[PDB]
Write a protein that binds this ligand. Sequence first.
Ligand code: HEC
Ligand code: HEC
Ligand code: HEC
Ligand code: HEC
Ligand code: HEC
Ligand code: HEC
Ligand code: HEC
Ligand code: HEC
Ligand code: HEC
Ligand code: HEC
Ligand SMILES: [Ca+2]
Ligand SMILES: [Ca+2]
Ligand SMILES: [Eu+2]
Ligand SMILES: [Eu+2]
Ligand SMILES: [Eu+2]
Ligand SMILES: [Eu+2]
Lengths: 441, 441
Amino acid sequence: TVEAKNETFAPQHPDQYLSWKATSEQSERVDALAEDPRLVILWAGYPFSRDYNKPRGHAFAVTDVRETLRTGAPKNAEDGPLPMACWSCKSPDVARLIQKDGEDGYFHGKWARGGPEIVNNLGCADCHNTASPEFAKGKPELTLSRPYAARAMEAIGKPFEKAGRFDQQSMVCGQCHVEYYFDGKNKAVKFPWDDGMKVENMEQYYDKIAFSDWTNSLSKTPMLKAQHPEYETWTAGIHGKNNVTCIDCHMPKVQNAEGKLYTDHKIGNPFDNFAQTCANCHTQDKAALQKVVAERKQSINDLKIKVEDQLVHAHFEAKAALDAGATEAEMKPIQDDIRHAQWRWDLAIASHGIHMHAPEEGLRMLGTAMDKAADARTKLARLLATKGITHEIQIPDISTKEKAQQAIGLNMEQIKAEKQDFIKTVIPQWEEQARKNGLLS
Amino acid sequence: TVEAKNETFAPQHPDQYLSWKATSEQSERVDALAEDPRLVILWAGYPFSRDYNKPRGHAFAVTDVRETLRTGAPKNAEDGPLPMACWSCKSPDVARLIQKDGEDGYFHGKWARGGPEIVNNLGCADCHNTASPEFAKGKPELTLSRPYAARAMEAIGKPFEKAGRFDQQSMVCGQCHVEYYFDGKNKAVKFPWDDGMKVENMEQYYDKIAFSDWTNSLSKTPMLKAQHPEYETWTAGIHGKNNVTCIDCHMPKVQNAEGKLYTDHKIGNPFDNFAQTCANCHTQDKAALQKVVAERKQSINDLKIKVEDQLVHAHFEAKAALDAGATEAEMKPIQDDIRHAQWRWDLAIASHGIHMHAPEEGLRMLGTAMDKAADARTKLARLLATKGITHEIQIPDISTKEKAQQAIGLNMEQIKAEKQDFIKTVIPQWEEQARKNGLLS
Ligand code: HEC
Ligand code: HEC
Ligand code: HEC
Ligand code: HEC
Ligand code: HEC
Ligand code: HEC
Ligand code: HEC
Ligand code: HEC
Ligand code: HEC
Ligand code: HEC
Ligand SMILES: [Ca+2]
Ligand SMILES: [Ca+2]
Ligand SMILES: [Eu+2]
Ligand SMILES: [Eu+2]
Ligand SMILES: [Eu+2]
Ligand SMILES: [Eu+2]
């Protein structure tokens, strides 16, 4: 009884439907690797070294997961680099399939397999029990449509159904806006929250089960990859501590033309509606609050770049150590420190809202990353010396995304042409198939 | 015109006099070197490595300066390690001498010279223009009694005489609760604020004038010492941004037994009268707000320790490089990085209020400290390698203050013995002379 076809709800709920549709205006797709080429080096050997953009409107989730280089150019339903779990946070079709096929059945297999199944935009059935008769009557009926997210909330001692209204509001965002990994043979989404949500809890969690996301191809370090941990870091910041929910800033209550209050579904930058967001709680003016936020943004940016630069040198120094014949046992304590430094850095800055949601926590994490990078490069200098190398390791030119991608052995020309071909030809086929099966309108 | 004998004011201003006197209740003198022996290593060759306690009541300023190991046991008025400037932030006799002898005449000579002249407790004339007829009438007539504090406020574009009431409130505290250095042959107190009050502004300021406070005796680094930068960090934090003044929290308006409002002069922990401090602006209860502050205290302490462990290794590694024949030119780039690393650290945590006044800026500075610490230690491992050393440098046992002070070659037993003799012998002579001269009731 999951209804992925969002337009079904438009006549009944035009205020929400129309503002939900309006994230298509948040259309700028900003190239983060271009802005920061050092990312290409840290993520060397991982699909993030190919294509990483800043988040844009919910309306683009499906297009973005289709179009990113990270998903590649699969040639059949069992091909392509990535698994079914990549659709999970993109489309209400995920809730449809989890319902139709069960959770294990949904996760089974490759991302390509879901192409003709997962076609509706991130929407109503992701956050709402749209089956409930109270929903047509205009009550939200908030629900967790994703059982892995429900299990995670229970893991942190906050089961959804026993939570109050205000906790639930943030929990629906917390279905997607979290750090996750792929667990088990089927690569199911799991939130690493069993020992809590602090960078130190997750770090020890991942070490205890010996998990790695990929091996950095320069340093050979078994690495952990952080993703957008908004729920975890918001929980850590002063706003979250005061139960200022994601919704208080992100989905303000606004009035339609006839003066009726509804929830603004145009999920974006809270500053775009300051009067209905921050102004509900703060007497300071818009420019004053923007300036403070911009300053924490810059403070974080400056320290993040320092840590990234240490991390670039460390990877290249570990590369030189390997090139000078370092063995696995020689490298292991170095790679442990790289893994930890980089885990701490990535969780600190993988949420683009960290300077707003929990700037102290972001800054703290970057300091603890820095501590491990120092340990890595110090160990590395001693290892290099034992191989008879006592000079500074030179780094190749990485002044642009293109040079850094080339520096790590990526043929971007081919990766892009194959991708371009996949987008022009396969997508239109997936949409046609979806329509013929009445999955798409 | 300065009246340094505070009790002169007890009849006219009893509510303020009696609460001012009550800082004598705040009497615990907590040994900060015992709590953190790494400080002895960082400060090796400087008096802070001998004796450093946490702040206590204003009532003890004079006592503490007399009794600390840092001022030693001068045998006469031309003796002892420190200058007149050490009196400057302890007593209203400072304001008396500056008026009497001029600011140059006050600064000339040794701390010992001022013993029999600087005898009254930190008090009314330090913050108030008590010579004004308006003062007898109960008006505050706040003033800057310290000309070097007045130049600093003008240097940051905030001349006191033009500042509104509420800016002036924190400026009185900013006569003392700042980072400073000793300038010129006479060792005059100066706030290094010409280029701004940010750690980066001050670092570049001290480098441009080629200033150091001392040479670390292990690494031979020309160091910068930070002191309690409350004014600077308060300005950088969210309260200062909102002109929540030092007074809003530390000197709240309270009622006497007859219901007359007055400024509470018992300057201490704002949480002791939570109902008239935080509760004036916040709805959260005391335990919740104490919990947040304690959490930031812990965050910063955790990171602070990591930085200090890296610095401890850096100084001993530098020691090892020197002992292996490193030249001045070889040491120079490493000492720059230790000097900068340690400056950023010390400025981050030399104010014991940092986790309250500006925890994000504290955490930010510690991360920039760690960036340089990583440079210093990577450099050192390479340089040590050129001397044929490729093993990690072992550190002596510094698990207690006493062990750390032994390791840096302090004869604590003789230092303490000489100091205790001085306290019991010279202080009463000073008091007797002051009384005889009408300076001390
Ligand atoms: C697809 C276009 C839809 C439609 C038809 C609706 N929504 Fe949402 N919604 C979400 C949240 C967090 C709230 C507020 C919850 C609360 O106040 O406790 C709402 C609110 C609603 C309502 C209730 C009426 C109102 O405006 O308050 C209705 C009828 C409604 N919405 C319809 C969360 C989400 C999403 C999270 C990412 C998604 C996507 C949607 N909603 C999508 C839709
Ligand atoms: C809209 C995007 C904003 C912005 C820019 C800010 N807020 Fe809030 N805020 C709220 C509460 C309860 C606090 C704790 C202080 C208190 O007890 O009053 C804050 C704190 C802040 C800060 C300072 C904290 C920091 O991160 O350093 C800043 C810069 C800030 N806020 C900006 C409460 C609310 C709301 C209540 C429902 C809402 C809405 C907002 N804030 C929105 C915003
Ligand atoms: C000349 C080098 C000295 C010496 C020997 C001392 N002072 Fe100060 N002092 C100032 C402030 C604001 C405090 C409280 C805040 C804090 O310590 O973080 C102190 C405290 C002390 C103490 C007690 C604590 C300790 O270190 O054990 C002692 C013994 C002490 N001082 C000695 C302010 C200032 C200044 C304001 C510009 C100046 C100058 C000095 N102090 C100088 C010295
Ligand atoms: C999975 C079904 C999601 C849920 C539930 C929520 N969000 Fe989301 N969000 C998701 C994705 C995959 C993206 C990126 C989309 C793209 O193609 O780039 C986003 C994006 C945002 C943004 C950025 C918007 C922009 O930059 O223009 C914001 C501020 C945001 N999301 C907030 C947000 C809130 C508050 C949520 C709970 C009401 C929420 N999201 C839920 C995936 C999912
Ligand atoms: C939730 C549990 C997710 C899983 C599993 C995956 N993604 Fe996602 N994605 C999620 C959110 C909340 C956001 C927006 C916030 C942000 O910081 O990015 C995104 C965004 C994307 C994007 C657009 C931004 C970009 O990186 O270019 C893409 C292309 C993307 N996601 C792809 C993608 C892939 C390939 C996944 C499987 C590894 C995947 N996502 C999983 C939430 C979640
Ligand atoms: C105000 C108290 C907020 C709360 C609570 C939440 N968010 Fe937020 N977020 C807020 C602002 C003002 C900004 C913009 C920062 C800026 O420099 O303008 C953001 C940013 C995000 C982002 C990054 C989006 C992007 O860069 O594309 C995301 C994904 C986001 N916010 C999501 C989010 C979630 C899921 C929240 C609850 C866990 C949440 N925010 C709370 C303001 C506030
Ligand atoms: C700085 C550490 C101070 C010292 C030492 C003393 N006073 Fe004070 N006083 C100070 C401030 C910052 C204020 C508040 C000014 C404002 O704008 O509100 C005051 C206030 C007074 C007043 C005014 C009446 C009142 O608000 O209580 C008086 C008469 C006064 N103070 C007297 C006084 C006496 C007698 C002192 C020594 C025993 C003394 N003050 C010390 C700052 C400081
Ligand atoms: C020099 C004349 C000062 C002025 C003016 C102010 N403060 Fe101060 N303070 C000063 C010293 C030398 C000390 C340490 C005293 C000691 O012997 O340890 C302090 C201490 C404080 C404290 C700590 C109190 C305690 O720990 O019990 C606080 C909270 C404090 N000072 C705050 C403060 C405020 C708000 C001021 C302006 C009203 C102020 N101080 C002025 C030196 C001087
Ligand atoms: C509340 C918004 C404050 C303002 C503004 C200022 N101070 Fe403060 N300070 C505050 C608290 C609650 C505390 C104690 C923190 C804790 O862990 O309980 C402090 C601490 C200090 C200290 C350290 C005192 C000590 O450890 O002995 C000092 C010296 C101090 N505060 C001084 C000070 C100055 C000079 C300020 C204006 C520049 C200032 N504070 C503002 C609360 C608040
Ligand atoms: C007004 C004269 C205040 C007094 C007294 C105290 N606080 Fe405050 N606080 C005030 C403002 C205007 C703000 C900015 C947020 C806002 O409401 O606009 C704050 C902020 C805080 C915070 C959050 C920021 C942070 O430091 O992480 C905390 C934790 C806080 N305040 C605590 C606190 C305590 C413990 C106080 C007494 C010692 C206190 N505040 C006094 C205004 C004022
Ligand atoms: Ca992850
Ligand atoms: Ca100094
Ligand atoms: Eu965006
Ligand atoms: Eu104290
Ligand atoms: Eu408030
Ligand atoms: Eu804050």
